[PDB]
Structure formats: structure tokens, C-alpha cells
Specification:
The PDB classes it as hydrolase. Keywords: structural genomics, joint center for structural genomics, jcsg, protein structure initiative, PSI-biology, hydrolase. It forms a dimeric assembly. The structure is a homodimer of 445-residue chains. In chain A, α4 runs parallel beside α6 (144-161). In chain A, β14 (404-406) and β15 form a beta hairpin. In chain A, the strands form six sheets. Chain A has a three-stranded antiparallel beta sheet. A three-stranded antiparallel beta sheet of chain A has the order 6-9-10. A three-stranded antiparallel beta sheet of chain A has the order 13-14-15, with no helix packed on it. Chain A has 445 residues and is mainly alpha-helical. Helix content of chain A is 43%, strand content 11%. The first copy, chain A, has a single domain (13-445), classed as Glycosyltransferase. The longest helix of chain A is centred in the middle third of the chain and has 22 residues, at 239-260. Chain A is built from 16 helices and 15 strands. In chain A, 56% of the residues are buried. The interface between A and B is large, with 40 and 40 residues.
Chain lengths: 445, 445
């Protein structure tokens, strides 16, 4: 396999190793078993720094891979599929708790920031951004989903393990920050305190209108300055992220009620979730002449819509994966047909495969994430099989998941070492195995 | 008045001076007569460098004013209102021929460029832009309207004066270049030869997707990478510019047939104009739930629309002014209600005035150009009066037209010296006088 040598692996989990052995024995396709082995543990192998803080509480720093900082998004997804093993592995469990606690610490340092350093560093590369940068931050691109992924992870950890110890005063500070930030970004009474520009040739790495972005009408939705691709939004009410905020606020509300016994703060979360949900139903649905009612990718509240999808989760395609809409919501099913078609400007189809990319890497570059999400949200084995086959056929022989690959030639690719994507691939294969679809995977020749 | 001292004025026209005295003696409102005197001749006073070329032919270089280079657009507009005087003033007429011939020379240097130097400036400010630069260019932002404005000026010059001497072999080369460039930018067979990025904090001064912009589907419309604001397009089929291309190609078709006797090249212009017109009819009309059928500001050919307007002409509001749609086109009339409303993200209304701006200067900055265009396309004297009074009341006492002013405070403004806008003001007042509406202007206290 392509895992690091054992002495070079950063974090070892007995339960992860045992699960790798179990899947290896069930899978008859050698390439698939190998890819699983490379990818499922890649986070633990290459990105995880577990320790105890000054207070004796667990603390885990998680790098993205070939970008050396911790994203709230990537870290929340990178350890996600390990939660289901935590009850059998105390060391794994405490590492997970450490991730969540480190995420809350990040939110409290700056709830607008997407990417964090492990303490202060000097001469950070993005210190020159025209925004309120600090040495503790790697980057300060405001992305709604940065605040959702930790809530998601914390809720699943708590439900799985029963361990409420993570919901301490730093949690209360973090959810209080999440509420403040989301409300600022509804922009009801003014543009808010967040502004961003950067001197760059990359148009989506800076923000129009002196760092405020295109105007929005403050109908109750939350502005996301940037997408989970880290690209600026076009119309600033980013729809899949708003849907993720609704779910995440409701999870926070349940924690605050049942664990913290803070019913006022719980209600603040539920009320905001409801406001956003009501506004999404009113403003985010577009009567498409070909596909019927679909969800727009972005809106501005004035009546504009942006009909497309980007591979990064939260995306329109992946909403049932995160649990933000039902997979059988008829509007979602119409949307799924739309995003996976040449009516979507960021859908590409070529000699080697097809799928969704976006403006991050640009034309003709398909993201394995989109194909994985197509599989995650599929209700048909034949569709799932085409997805897994394509993921296997587009790795350029590396045994790993990439950011993107060229539609006509998977040897042209980006990000060799992208731990979130490796985690997702392991998660997908493990899901299929656990759902009784081993025979389906073994039919891949 | 605020004109330069006589000995500092760059170009003198007898006919212009006579019209100023005419208007001064007719107008009872002293501030309006003073504004006309400041504004109407501003281009001649401050931006026109007329000479005889080595070859005998007139040549006129026209600076924008407080930005020091020649735009195809600005130069085309700056001298526009003088054409009506050309039959009375040989020196003015020759100067106007020289603008046109200089414009054709510019187009032949680079038909993608918006802005030109008077000769070569190898260390020019923008020579570092990530595009194919030449020292003769000030800036190389691809704007469809750059190629339209010279065609419009030449046609009006020819129709007014009868002088076809401007339609020489440099003209043939220029129109050939226009056709070639427009067709490249339909992107039927690939993305074309034009790409642009710039390292800048200003998001709309560089272009997404590695300098290609957001994908379009090649339905027959022409891509404009930038708008007449010099801001990058969002969806790249810029609708008012496409409508302007239709009219301009049809003017070029007439000239080529009647003057040059080139029936094939004439037909190529007619056929392209028709292709674009048919595509506009099929793709640029949006069924707005409030306003009815309207014209989108931009489309991508996939089914996306961008519902807004920007002050800069060509704009949706200004289409009847340029002659690209009839003022009583019902879809235009719906569009006009839409663009001058708070449903347009770039319409602003405050304590001092109201009107359309754009992302160039950003939030709450109204451009006098929009108010002027509302008056140019008005069919009601009361509306015209309100616009003239607003122009007078929002000059911050300078006696000149600005780029933009704050909706609550005209003393906060941009571009003190903007010759295009000054010319346009003088054009507007002279139009109203020549239409017999001086009593309307005299009713302003």
C-alpha cells in the first residue's frame, strides 16, 4: 500500500486498523481494497496532532494535507467516519473530542475565519489580506459552512458516544459566536463587520464592491462571502450552506436544551433556523423550464438566481448526504437531474469521465467529490457501481483521491494529498460494505 | 465660467462657441446656462489633440480627462454631440474625421483593447497585465462596445456630412477586424484567443476560470469580458452590448455596400447582426413576476440571467438613446420600470437623489449618467424636468458632471474631471433646446 511507513504515521487507531483488515477480507477487487487501505486512514496517518492542553483536556490539530493549516470544514469532515468506531477505541474517542474542542477554540479566536494555524506564526502568507488578519489565522474567508461542520461533528460524537463533556464554557462561547455571526450576516440593519479583499490575479479570491460583495436584500437568508471551494460567491445568499445552517442550528439547539439546560440560547438557535428555512422555501426555489422546480445554488433576495452547482460539500447535489433535505424531496430530485447535466455551467463530460467541478480550478476539471456525492445520494445500485468504477478509473494510478482531474485525461490532476477526499472515499466504501452491498462492489472486475 | 483660460484650451470650434452664446441667451436659469458653458465644450477645451498626420490625413488623439489615455468608447462619445455642427465648421469637421481615423488605427493595433497610448509607452502602468500587451496599448480589457462606438461615430459623421473619405483601406482593415473579433467571441469552436488576468484587489478588474470567465453556451451571442464600466461581466453575454453590436454591424453593412461597394463584406456584417438579434430574442428576455417580460442585463446561454443595470452606456436603460430598441418596445418599457427601482441591486435612493450605479464605485454611489439617460429616453416633460433639476442639484457646486455621487450627499463624489459626462450633459440640454423645449428648462427655478 501507499500509506506512510508505520514510524511516520502521526496517529494510530486500533479500531481503524481492525476495520481496514475487515474490509480487505470482504473485498475481492484488489485495486478497490488497496484504495480503501490508502484512503480510509489517511487523515490519521498524515494530518492528526493529538495532545493534552494546559488544562488537561484533549486537543487535536488537523492539517488539510498539502495545504499546511487547519480548516474548520476539512477537519470536521476528515474525522467524520471515525466517529462510528469511537465506542470501541478510547484513544480514538479522545482524539475526536480533541478535534471538536480545537474547533471551538478556533471559532472563538475568529468566527469569520476559515483556516487556522497551530498557535501564532510569524510571516503568515495571507497576513497581507485586506481584512482583520491575526497571526493565529491562516486565512479569514467567511464561509457559513466553516461554522456548520464543527456543530455537525460535535452532535454526531455526542449521539454516538454519550460523552457530553465537550459542551463546556468554550462551547457556549462558540455557539454564541455562531449565532452572532450568522445574524450579522443576515445584513438586516447594515452590511456587517466583515470585509475582505486580496491583491491577486484570481478573481474569486477577492470580493467586489470594496470587499462587501454584490448587494443583497436582507430577506432572512445568511450571506456567505465564500463557498466551501474557498471561491467568492456570485450572489451572496449561498443556498446549500443556508440549508446546512438550518440543520446545524437545530442540532445546537438540542444540545443546549438537553445538555446545557440553556433554553433561551436553544430557542435563539431554533428561531434563526426557522427564519432561514422559511426564507429558503420562499426565495431559493426556481421554476426551471426544463427541469421543473429546482433549488438555486445562490440567490440575492432581489430576485436573482444562480443556476449551477459546485463539487464542494455543501453543494446542491450533496444536501441529502449532510441530511439537509430528504433524498426524495421532489425539488431535490429535479435539482439532481439539473446539476448533473450540460445545463449546469460547471458540469464537464469527456473521454475519461464526467462530473461537477467549478471555477476554483476552472474548465474541464472534474472533482471526484461530485462523483462520490452522486454515489452517497444514490438510490440505485447500478448508479452506485458506475460511480465507484469511475473513482477507481480516474486516480492516475496513485491509489488516492484528488481535488480534480481533467475530463479527458486523469493524469492531469490537482492536489495529490487531500485528506478530506481520502476520508470521503473510505467513508463511502465502508458505508456500502455496512449496508450489505459487498456483492455489488465485488462485481467490479 | 469654469472653462480653462482661453490660451489653455486645446481645440477651438467657432460653431461650438456660437452654440454656447445661443444657449446662454435662451436660458433664464443662470446655473443651468453656466453648467452648459462649462460642460458642452469641455472635450475640446481639455482633451483634444488634433494634428495633420505625416500622410496628410487628419488625426485626433482624445484623452478621457483625469485618466490619461484614449478609450475607443470615451472618445467615441466625447465628440458625438459635435457631429451635428460639422457642416458649419470645417476645422471641427476635420477634427472629427481625425478621431474616427485614429479609432480605426487603434482597432487595427489590437481589436481586443479598450484603451490606447499616443504612441508606444513600454513601461505603461498596465504592461504587467496577464494578457498579450503591446506598448501602444494603455489597457487590454475586451469590451464589445469598444468596437461599436467608432462604428456609430463614423456612420453619423458620414450621414451628417456626406464625407466618405474616412472609409479607406484602414477602415476595411478595421471592420474586418471587428467581424473577426465578434465571431471569435461567439466561442462556437473553442474559448477563443483572448484571456485576461491582473494582480489586483479589485475583483472585477480580473477574470475567473484562469482568465476565461464563467462558461457560456455558444448560442450565437457575443461574449464581452468587460462592461462599459470597465468591470468584468458576471454572465458573459452582455445584453445591452450585444444589442449595440446589432445596430453597429448594420451601419457598417450600409457603409460597405453604399461607399465601398463590397457586397460580400457587407453581407457578412448583416448576417452576423441578424444571428445576434435572433439569439437576443430567444435568450435575453426574462419573465419577471413583478415587471413582466424584461431584458436581462447578462445571460450565459445555459439559462442563467443577471437582472440588474449599470449606469454606463450601453446600459439597458439607454438602449433607445443609442437606437438599439424602440422607446416604445413594451419589453423595454417593463425593463425601464425594473432598472429604476429597488428591485435592481445597483439602484440607489437617498436624501439627495436617486439613480443607477454599479459595482465599479460600489454601494450607494449614483452616476449622473443614469439620470441623463432617464431624461434622454423620457417621453414626459415632467420626468425630464425632474432629471435636469437633479443633475443641477447634485454637482456639489462644481458646475460639472461627475462619475458618481453619494445618494445622501453629493459632496462625496468621484471624478471631478470627466469629459464624456460633460459632453453628454451639453448634448442633453442642446437636444431639449433644438426640440423646442426651452420653456420647460426656463421653468426650473
Amino acid at each position: 500500500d501507499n500509506r506512510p511507513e508505520i514510524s511516520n504515521r502521526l496517529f494510530r487507531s486500533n479500531a481503524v486498523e481492525k476495520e481496514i483488515l475487515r474490509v480487505q477480507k470482504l473485498l475481492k477487487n484488489a485495486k478497490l481494497a488497496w484504495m480503501f487501505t490508502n484512503c480510509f486512514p489517511n487523515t490519521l496517518d498524515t494530518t492528526v496532532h493529538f495532545r493534552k492542553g494546559s488544562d488537561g483536556k484533549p486537543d487535536t490539530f488537523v492539517y488539510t494535507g498539502d495545504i499546511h493549516a487547519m480548516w474548520l470544514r476539512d477537519s470536521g469532515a476528515q474525522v467524520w467516519p471515525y466517529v462510528q468506531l469511537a465506542n470501541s477505541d478510547p484513544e480514538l474517542k479522545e482524539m475526536l473530542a480533541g478535534v471538536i474542542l480545537r474547533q471551538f477554540k478556533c471559532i472563538n479566536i475568529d468566527p469569520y475565519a476559515n483556516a487556522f494555524n497551530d498557535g501564532a506564526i510569524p510571516d503568515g502568507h495571507w497576513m497581507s489580506d485586506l481584512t482583520d488578519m491575526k497571526p493565529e489565522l491562516h486565512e479569514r474567508k467567511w464561509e457559513i459552512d466553516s461554522l456548520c461542520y464543527p456543530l455537525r461533528l460535535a452532535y454526531h460524537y455526542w449521539k454516538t458516544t454519550g460523552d457530553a463533556s465537550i459542551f463546556n464554557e468554550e462551547w457556549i462561547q462558540a455557539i454564541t459566536n455562531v449565532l452572532k455571526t450568522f445574524k450579522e450576516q443576515q445584513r438586516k440593519d447594515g452590511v456587517g463587520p466583515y470585509k475582505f479583499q486580496r491583491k491577486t490575479e484570481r478573481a474569486l479570491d477577492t470580493v467586489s464592491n470594496d470587499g462587501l460583495g454584490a448587494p443583497v436584500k436582507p430577506v432572512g437568508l445568511i450571506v456567505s462571502s465564500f463557498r466551501p471551494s474557498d471561491d467568492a460567491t456570485t450572489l451572496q445568499f449561498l443556498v446549500p450552506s443556508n440549508f446546512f445552517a438550518v440543520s446545524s442550528l437545530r442540532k445546537a439547539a438540542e444540545i443546549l436544551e438537553k445538555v446545557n439546560k440553556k433554553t433561551a440560547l436553544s430557542k435563539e438557535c431554533k428561531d434563526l433556523a426557522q427564519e432561514v428555512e422559511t426564507a429558503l422555501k420562499k426565495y431559493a426555489v426556481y421554476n426551471h423550464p426544463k427541469y421543473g422546480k429546482i433549488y438555486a445554488f445562490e440567490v440575492d433576495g432581489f430576485g436573482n438566481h444562480h443556476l449551477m452547482d459546485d463539487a464542494n460539500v455543501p453543494s446542491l447535489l450533496a444536501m441529502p448526504y449532510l441530511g439537509d433535505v430528504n433524498v426524495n424531496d421532489p425539488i431535490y430530485q429535479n435539482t439532481r437531474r439539473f446539476v448533473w447535466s450540460e445545463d449546469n455551467p460547471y458540469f464537464f463530460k469527456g473521454k475519461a469521465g464526467e462530473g461537477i467541478g467549478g471555477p476554483h480550478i476552472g474548465y474541464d476539471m472534474v472533482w471526484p467529490m461530485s462523483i462520490m456525492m452522486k454515489a452517497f445520494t444514490s438510490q440505485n445500485d447500478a448508479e452506485i457501481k458506475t460511480c465507484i468504477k469511475m473513482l477507481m478509473d480516474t486516480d492516475a494510478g496513485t491509489g488516492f483521491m484528488h481535488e480534480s482531474f481533467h475530463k479527458d485525461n486523469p493524469k492531469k490532476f490537482t492536489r495529490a494529498w487531500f485528506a478530506w477526499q481520502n476520508t470521503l472515499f473510505g467513508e463511502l466504501i465502508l458505508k456500502l460494505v455496512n449496508e450489505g452491498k459487498v456483492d455489488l462492489l465485488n462485481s467490479i472486475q
